[PDB]
Symmetry: C8
Subunit: 62 residues, 8 copies
């Protein structure tokens, strides 16, 4: 993996969107623009996580 990035994008398609976020090298960030989502989709996976589950996933990606 030449990119130097490990992690994933996450979002929900449920009624209660939080937009897109990512874990990148163990750091959680918000992604504001569509362009950046598409850019990182070239190099890391993009999965669905419901709003109610984000807190637990945060615990495990710490």
């Amino acid at each position: 993996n030449v990119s130097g990035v490990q992690g994933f994008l996450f979002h929900t398609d449920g009624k209660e969107s939080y937009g897109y976020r990512a874990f990148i090298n163990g750091v959680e960030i918000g992604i504001k623009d569509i362009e950046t989502v598409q850019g990182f989709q070239q190099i890391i996976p993009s999965i669905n996580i419901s709003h109610s589950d984000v807190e637990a996933i945060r615990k495990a990606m710490k």
Copy 2:
């Protein structure tokens, strides 16, 4: 493995269901929503574990 996640989802098809859970980077979490299960099934395996065996698996998975 670009995702930065090692682990697995687990559930039982037996009578005493505990829903879905996962080990994610050595942290055990409960998973509240179907969308999250399907999200993580994109990047980690999903296996069956009896209610009766979770305690021993917990011991191995720190």
Copy 3:
């Protein structure tokens, strides 16, 4: 190996069964239910070890 598990299931088909056990990440456990055996067979190998040899294998997986 995305599962975060290294190890193997072991059992004997000799007259003197000890059921199924596993080394998971260097930790020995007993597996009580058939469902759990089949689940872990999705991600780690499953080999035969006679009852008389388990003590030596324990020494080496310590």
Copy 4:
């Protein structure tokens, strides 16, 4: 990966261009010349990042 380089080029196709930049082994640099962009595109990925998201990516990429 024989190059000894992990990282990526990034740029925006939006209105507020910042040219090309890169993370190379966790160091952020600006890239002044087209020849260098084309050189590094031989060994590292090249993705789109909005001007608005660079600050968060910076935080993840140390």
Copy 5:
């Protein structure tokens, strides 16, 4: 290598047989039963080592 085992079985086909033995994660053990030999042949290689050479191999294999 998902098994968490690195090592090999060894035996001699010469006149002074010592049965089967193995190095498993740098620990030397004797193997008492055919079932165990066949089990481990599923996950580690099995080679020939003369009785006369075991002492030197021991020195290398710590």
Copy 6:
């Protein structure tokens, strides 16, 4: 990678040549002879970097 070398050759085809250089295992060197360039091109990549960008790349390969 059996060669024990990670890095790359770099040069510019711009008007202002600095000849060939390389980062080899994090050490920057000049390559004076054509024979050596061709030799290392057998084992590491060879990319273009403009003279104006070498200073930044040096910073990141430190």
Copy 7:
């Protein structure tokens, strides 16, 4: 590499034989029996080194 062995067998076909030797996990040993040579040829490479060069190779495999 599941064998837990890194190294090589070496011998000379020059007039001045030293028999077979090996570096196994950074430890030099002599191999006395043909059976052991053939056994290790299943898992590590077997190359030619002249008697006059063994001293230098020893220096580098230390």
Copy 8:
């Protein structure tokens, strides 16, 4: 790479030959015999390095 060797042979086809040499696990050695060159060409690459560039390569290869 099962050999436990990382490195390369080097020589020059220029007028000032130094014979064959190698870096083997970060140690530079001279190689006295053709048989050894052919042996190591089985496990490590063999490249051209001008007499004039050896000093710089030495600096990188520690």
